[PDB]
Design a protein around this ligand. Structure first.
Ligand code: BCL
Ligand code: BCL
Ligand code: BCL
Ligand code: BCL
Ligand SMILES: CC[C@H]1c2cc3[nH]c4c(c3C)C(=O)[C@H](C(=O)OC)c4c3nc(cc4[nH]c(cc(n2)[C@@H]1C)c(C(C)=O)c4C)[C@@H](C)[C@@H]3CCC(=O)OC/C=C(/C)CCC[C@H](C)CCC[C@@H](C)CCCC(C)C
Ligand SMILES: CC[C@H]1c2cc3[nH]c4c(c3C)C(=O)[C@H](C(=O)OC)c4c3nc(cc4[nH]c(cc(n2)[C@@H]1C)c(C(C)=O)c4C)[C@@H](C)[C@@H]3CCC(=O)OC/C=C(\C)CCC[C@H](C)CCC[C@@H](C)CCCC(C)C
Ligand SMILES: COC1=C(OC)C(=O)C(C/C=C(\C)CC/C=C(/C)CC/C=C(\C)CC/C=C(/C)CC/C=C(\C)CC/C=C(/C)CC/C=C(/C)CC/C=C(\C)CC/C=C(\C)CCC=C(C)C)=C(C)C1=O
Ligand SMILES: COC1=C(OC)C(=O)C(C/C=C(\C)CC/C=C(\C)CC/C=C(\C)CC/C=C(\C)CC/C=C(\C)CC/C=C(\C)CC/C=C(\C)CC/C=C(\C)CC/C=C(/C)CCC=C(C)C)=C(C)C1=O
Ligand SMILES: COC(C)(C)C(=O)C/C=C(\C)CC/C=C(\C)CC/C=C(\C)CCCC/C(C)=C/CCC(C)CC/C=C(\C)CCC=C(C)C
Ligand SMILES: CCCCCCCCCCCC[N+](C)(C)[O-]
Ligand SMILES: CCCCCCCCCCCC[N+](C)(C)[O-]
Ligand SMILES: CCCCCCCCCCCC[N+](C)(C)[O-]
Ligand SMILES: CCCCCCCCCCCC[N+](C)(C)[O-]
Ligand SMILES: [Fe+2]
Lengths: 248, 280, 297
């Protein structure tokens, strides 16, 4: 009976397919570790897959995975329990230490490039022909923190050239320097651009970019991690919704 | 155990209830207050179903089936044997799902990410509630809900459908299906595109987003973009479930006959209703 | 929410990558739609149109017009009727008696066969287009492979199954309501399709695609604040976006995926919809006349 044979063979195929799929999804994060960085006893029923090599464009080398590439950098955390499964509380300022929801990864310290070899992200003033085509143009607007105080002013939009979209807002602070704010972490209103994740006092703390004309993947991660980490670590300074309504 | 890059994220906080009380992990799973609640509701429902099986006379998965109260009970309670168990399991299901969702919100907070996932899941929960809570209530009888059986629930889908002829004619139903088909189409497309770039022709360098964009641009004359293809996927999936719930909430509440007859409003429209020819 | 963009940006038209593509077959850039601009890209075109594209595009329109002409015919060339009965018209296939021949008279089967031939050409020529556009750009053939799964069911429904059964009368009619009726009748004559194991699997994968795309779509959006949508770069050099995404699921359901891997789960979840479906339909009427009966023994 073909039908019985077919449904029987399908279940055998599916089992192997899930097995194959699961192993392909272990090319990052494995082998597992004990909370102290040592390899765990039980790695589960699925085995590491045979390595694969990505030939990276723009002569940026290759990437073999899974690979021994370790954690490396220091983490400002300390376990709060003797057994496993418990939180590890920060020993310093989580925001400034880049841990917890404020975490970042040591990505390549070079800008992401578009298919043509050029810097993927650029400040609009240096992006030939680029302009705001719809919606409120944020440039020139003051920036308000979650504490309802003025953190600075928008002096430019950082544009993703190929994807032809806005990625960051360049906000100038009191001291005259600027910082990059993730576009999806700001709210562009008709008279302000509000940033709920951070309070005016946390802006100077946003990680900086070494060069004023580009951002490296490493810097994007620190900036983004830092800003997101404010949802939790800047909660004390986050005034309420009614308070915001009260300030028109 | 943890993923080689996990430790730095396992910090305190994010909880909505109970503070640090249940703020810990069991292996890979994060618990939190709602993780506990999920277990509770889940266990209670599985136990009550297993209990319904005893009273039924089987442990055969393909035969076990917990039915809702008969139409005789309207929206009132019923003996654990004639609808009660169902009622309480339906309660445990709703309590497990909702808790599961609230459990994802706490995880989002500890990870510092958006709440899109649980928000998306809630659409699944609402479609479920439409079938076992909303529609039954609007029709005033728990008995209109679907039975909890691997096979008995298809009987319900089948009998519920034919009550109005060929269900294909339910207009909201056509829309739901369209989003379901379109979404699978889009899922296969997205998966294939990202893969075709990361895994190019042997020996060459992995392609770039510009290649993904040009491939699709050459193929159909448009590229929705990386951010847009993910919004599309979420949009297509949630819309499929939104219209699924809609097509049911109106069946047996504001519409009662053969769905096919509903298309008459267009055929009998005054101006062309009697023009000779065609099919009508 | 990051469902809609707050502000739109626009710059020089992006003509795309060159690689080994015949730049002579590409059109120019189309207009920019501010409307689409809130959800995805505003730029329309350019589009590549070689002989395959024109061929396919020709057959496709012909397929569509053969049906259209038939509709106008049975509408009495009356515009008011055409619109009134648009959903009720149908280009039916040759009656059983004609088997797999072309002997049937145009108005009773031939016109369907003509429309079908146009569709056959249109679909397959487009499949090559799918394979070739990838090749020119030096990309893998995943798209063409996946498209083949959808073609598999389409092929089973109107070609392979009807031939294995002896007549074109087994194929699907070209009509809105009629093809729906053909679907309800199909399940009816073969016992109840819900008893067809591959039909139930196909459903698991259809619901599963909705489930998986909601998950993935929401995940990437949930981490777009860390540039999570630049998936190729997250694959090449894992960022905090790919880690938080992985950890959300690991903490939620005990396991997770990788920025690349998730796309393998995706292509398979979607492709198995039409793969299992096509099998369950090809098996119906050829090997199993009644699914309830088959499942019984
Ligand atoms: C799978 C089992 C059945 C079946 C069961 C159903 C059921 C059940 C339903 C449909 C629905 C649809 N079916 Mg069907 N259908 C089958 C095979 C097909 C095939 C095929 C090539 O094999 C085609 C072209 C269609 C086409 C259609 C559309 C009219 C509609 C939306 C599909 C969709 O969203 O795709 C997703 C892809 C996209 C949106 C990309 C664009 C596709 C476009 C929109 C297709 C247009 C087709 C064109 C020829 C006519 C347009 C209508 C005009 C008035 C002329 N079906 C088989 C035989 N079909 C739904 C409907 O609304 O019917 C009225 C519905 O409820
Ligand atoms: C002969 C039968 C009738 C018919 C009768 C009906 C009836 C009656 C119904 C549908 C419904 C549906 N129909 Mg129909 N339908 C027919 C033919 C079709 C065809 C076809 C190709 O011919 C198609 C494509 C569809 C498609 C569809 C969908 C639009 C919809 C199902 C999706 C849904 O509701 O998601 C919603 C998703 C859910 C309910 C899932 C909820 C999940 C919950 C929240 C979580 C569960 C967690 C779990 C317990 C965990 C387990 C353990 C873990 C695994 C660890 N129908 C024929 C004509 N149709 C159903 C519908 O639209 O309902 C709204 C419905 O009620
Ligand atoms: C959606 C509209 C209809 C409906 C129409 C159909 C039709 C028609 C079919 C199914 C099919 C299935 N249905 Mg149903 N079904 C409904 C509501 C439900 C609910 C619910 C809580 O609302 C659940 C949990 C299920 C569960 C199931 C599975 C047994 C099976 C495959 C689902 C799948 O892969 O989806 C996608 C999800 C995933 C891939 C994730 C994994 C989900 C797993 C497999 C769920 C296991 C549930 C378990 C058996 C029962 C509860 C377990 C508890 C611990 C007790 N249905 C409503 C009433 N269902 C198919 C079948 O073969 O049934 C025999 C089928 O043909
Ligand atoms: C009363 C009706 C019967 C029934 C009869 C059938 C029949 C008959 C069939 C299905 C099929 C399917 N059914 Mg059923 N089904 C029932 C009840 C259900 C229920 C339900 C909740 O009750 C559900 C959820 C489903 C779900 C499903 C799907 C999983 C499956 C179709 C997958 C697909 O992607 O098709 C959409 C995809 C395709 C058809 C592929 C199309 C590919 C081509 C190349 C497209 C050409 C496009 C063309 C050129 C036009 C382009 C225009 C553009 C605008 C350019 N059925 C009841 C029991 N079902 C199909 C199946 O696979 O069964 C196993 C099938 O044939
Ligand atoms: C894994 C299975 C899923 C899947 C996958 C899939 N589909 C695919 C692919 C993949 C991976 C492709 O690569 C291929 C694609 O090219 O994507 C854009 C495609 C595709 N899937 C399509 C449709 C489609 N797929 C479907 C389903 C599915 N596709 C499954 C869910 C369905 C249904 C019924 O569910 C449909 C309807 C197409 C968009 C595309 C392939 C198109 C094709 O084959 O070429 C035909 C060519 C034509 C020129 C026909 C034109 C017909 C128009 C209606 C004419 C309009 C004329 C009008 C403008 C003028 C006349 C009137 C006026 C005068 C008023
Ligand atoms: C809304 C769009 C789609 C969607 C989205 C969606 N589903 C989701 C999510 C999202 C975004 C999650 O984050 C969540 C998830 O974590 O998945 C990995 C989930 C999820 N979707 C699931 C299933 C599911 N989703 C479905 C559908 C859909 N999900 C939609 C199409 C379907 C169907 C039938 O199409 C199913 C079967 C789970 C895998 C998971 C949520 C698991 C969960 O809630 O955990 C808590 C509960 C338990 C561990 C067990 C509870 C047991 C009960 C008490 C017993 C009573 C069961 C009874 C009501 C019926 C049983 C008989 C059946 C035969 C009917
Ligand atoms: C580069 O990147 C990219 C990718 O990556 C790789 C990609 O993959 C993709 C791939 C993506 C795509 C191809 C996307 C396509 C995109 C879309 C947006 C398509 C979405 C599709 C659809 C919505 C489906 C369209 C098709 C069809 C056939 C729709 C059919 C609908 C109907 C027949 C019904 C219409 C009519 C009506 C009236 C609605 C009925 C609804 C109701 C609720 C009515 C209920 C009624 C009643 C109960 C009775 C009436 C009663 C009333 C009103 C009141 C009470 C009564 C009184 C008397 C007072 C792209 C583009 C990409 O670029
Ligand atoms: C790009 O990005 C992305 C990723 O990644 C990079 C991703 O991955 C994903 C996600 C996708 C995938 C991994 C792909 C595969 C997924 C699918 C095909 C989708 C369908 C899914 C499934 C079939 C799997 C479903 C599984 C589920 C729902 C979970 C099953 C669950 C269980 C068996 C366990 C149930 C858990 C519960 C109830 C809650 C948690 C735990 C508890 C309640 C335990 C409580 C116990 C106690 C309190 C006891 C006391 C304990 C302790 C510790 C205290 C005392 C101890 C001392 C030491 C003192 C996406 C979308 C993505 O886009
Ligand atoms: C406005 O009016 C004009 C006239 C201007 C129009 O343009 C109007 C046009 C409309 C009226 C068109 C309306 C069209 C539809 C409503 C179409 C609907 C079509 C479907 C629902 C198709 C559904 C399914 C189709 C399937 C399953 C097709 C399968 C077919 C094949 C695999 C082809 C097999 C090939 C054959 C039999 C040819 C012979 C064999 C060879 C090997 C060549
Ligand atoms: C999680 C449930 C689904 C997966 C269950 C495990 C399937 C294992 C199949 C192993 C097949 C191995 N091999 C080498 C024979 O292909
Ligand atoms: C329907 C899809 C079901 C897929 C189930 C896959 C189970 C994989 C379990 C992976 C466990 C990972 N871990 C804990 C060892 O790291
Ligand atoms: C899905 C829609 C696809 C639209 C494709 C449009 C291509 C660009 C327009 C044709 C070229 C026009 N031209 C030469 C005047 O630039
Ligand atoms: C890539 C993930 C695949 C998930 C497959 C889930 C299968 C669910 C169970 C289907 C049950 C089918 N059947 C025929 C026995 O009814
Ligand atoms: Fe993706």
């Amino acid at each position: 009976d073909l039908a019985s044979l077919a449904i029987y063979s399908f279940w055998i195929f599916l089992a192997g397919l899930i097995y194959y799929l699961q192993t392909e999804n272990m090319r990052e994060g494995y082998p597992l570790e004990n909370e102290d960085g040592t390899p765990a006893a039980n790695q589960g029923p699925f085995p590491l897959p045979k390595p694969k090599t990505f030939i990276l464009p723009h002569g940026r080398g290759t990437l073999t995975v899974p690979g021994p590439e370790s954690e490396d950098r220091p983490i400002a955390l300390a376990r709060t329990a003797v057994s496993e499964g418990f939180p590890h509380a920060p020993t310093g300022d989580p925001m400034k230490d880049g841990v917890g929801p404020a975490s970042w990864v040591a990505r390549r310290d070079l800008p992401e490039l578009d298919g043509h070899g050029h810097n993927k992200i650029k400040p609009m003033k240096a992006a030939a022909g680029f302009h705001v085509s719809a919606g409120k143009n944020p440039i020139g607007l003051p920036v308000r923190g979650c504490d309802l105080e003025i953190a600075g002013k928008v002096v430019d939009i950082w544009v993703d050239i190929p994807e032809q979209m806005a990625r960051f807002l360049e906000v100038e602070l009191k001291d005259g320097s600027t910082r990059l704010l993730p576009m999806q972490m700001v709210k562009v209103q008709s008279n302000r651009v509000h940033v709920n994740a951070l309070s005016s006092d946390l802006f100077a703390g946003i990680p900086t970019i070494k060069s004023p004309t580009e951002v490296t993947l490493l810097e994007e991660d620190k900036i983004c991690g830092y800003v997101a980490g404010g949802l939790m670590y800047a909660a004390p300074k986050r005034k309420s919704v009614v308070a915001a309504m009260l300030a028109e | 155990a943890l993923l080689s890059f996990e430790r730095k994220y396992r910090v305190p906080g994010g909880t909505l209830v109970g503070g640090n009380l249940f703020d810990f992990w069991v292996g890979p799973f994060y618990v939190g207050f709602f993780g506990v609640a999920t277990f509770f509701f889940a266990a209670l429902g599985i136990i009550l179903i297993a209990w319904s099986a005893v009273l039924q006379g089987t442990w055969n998965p393909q035969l076990i089936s917990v039915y809702p109260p008969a139409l005789e009970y309207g929206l009132g309670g019923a003996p654990l044997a004639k609808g009660g168990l169902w009622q309480i399991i339906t309660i445990c299901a709703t309590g497990a799902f909702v808790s599961w969702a609230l459990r994802e919100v706490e995880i989002c907070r500890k990870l510092g990410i958006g709440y899109h996932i649980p928000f998306a899941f809630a659409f699944a929960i609402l479609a479920y509630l439409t079938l076992v809570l909303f529609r039954p209530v609007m029709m005033g009888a728990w008995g209109y809900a679907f039975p909890y059986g691997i096979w008995t629930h298809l009987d319900w889908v089948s009998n519920t459908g034919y009550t109005y002829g060929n269900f294909h004619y339910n207009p909201a139903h056509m829309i739901a299906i369209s989003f379901f088909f379109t979404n699978a189409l889009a899922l296969a497309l997205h998966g294939a595109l990202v893969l075709s770039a990361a895994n190019p022709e042997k020996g060459k360098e992995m392609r770039t987003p510009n290649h993904e964009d040009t491939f699709f641009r050459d193929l159909v004359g448009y590229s929705i973009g990386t951010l847009g293809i993910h919004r599309l996927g979420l949009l297509l999936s949630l819309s499929a479930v939104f219209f699924s719930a809609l097509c049911m909430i109106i069946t047996g509440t504001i519409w009662f006959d053969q769905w096919v007859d509903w298309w008459q409003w267009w055929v009998k429209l005054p101006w062309w209703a009697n023009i000779p020819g065609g099919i009508n | 929410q990051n469902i809609f963009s707050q502000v739109q940006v626009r710059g020089p038209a992006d003509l795309g990558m060159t690689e080994d593509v015949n730049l002579a077959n590409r059109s120019g850039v189309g207009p920019f739609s501010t409307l689409l601009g809130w959800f995805g890209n505003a730029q329309l075109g350019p589009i590549y149109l070689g002989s395959l594209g024109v061929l396919s595009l020709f057959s496709g329109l012909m397929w569509f017009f053969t049906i259209g002409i038939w509709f106008w015919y049975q509408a009495g060339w009356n515009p008011a009727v055409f619109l009134r009965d648009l959903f009720f018209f149908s280009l039916e296939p040759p009656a059983p008696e004609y088997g797999l021949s072309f002997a049937a008279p145009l108005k009773e089967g031939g016109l369907w066969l003509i429309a079908s031939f146009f569709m056959f050409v249109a679909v397959w020529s487009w499949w090559g287009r799918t394979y070739l556009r990838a090749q020119a750009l030096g990309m893998g053939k995943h798209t063409a492979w996946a498209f083949l799964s959808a073609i598999w069911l389409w092929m089973v429904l109107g070609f392979i199954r009807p031939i294995l059964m002896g007549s074109w009368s087994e194929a699907v009619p070209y009509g809105i309501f009629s093809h729906l009726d053909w679907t309800n009748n199909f399940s009816l004559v073969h016992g109840n399709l819900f008893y067809n194991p591959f039909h139930g699997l196909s459903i698991a994968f259809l619901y599963g695609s909705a489930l998986l795309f909601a998950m993935h779509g929401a995940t990437i959006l949930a981490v777009s604040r860390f540039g999570g949508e630049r998936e190729l770069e997250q694959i090449a050099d894992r960022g905090t976006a790919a880690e938080r995404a992985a950890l959300f699921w690991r903490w939620t359901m005990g396991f997770n995926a990788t920025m690349e891997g998730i796309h393998r789960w995706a292509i398979w979840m979607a492709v198995l919809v039409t793969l299992t479906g096509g099998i369950g339909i090809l098996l119906s009427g050829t090997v199993v006349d009644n699914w309830y009966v088959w499942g019984q023994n």
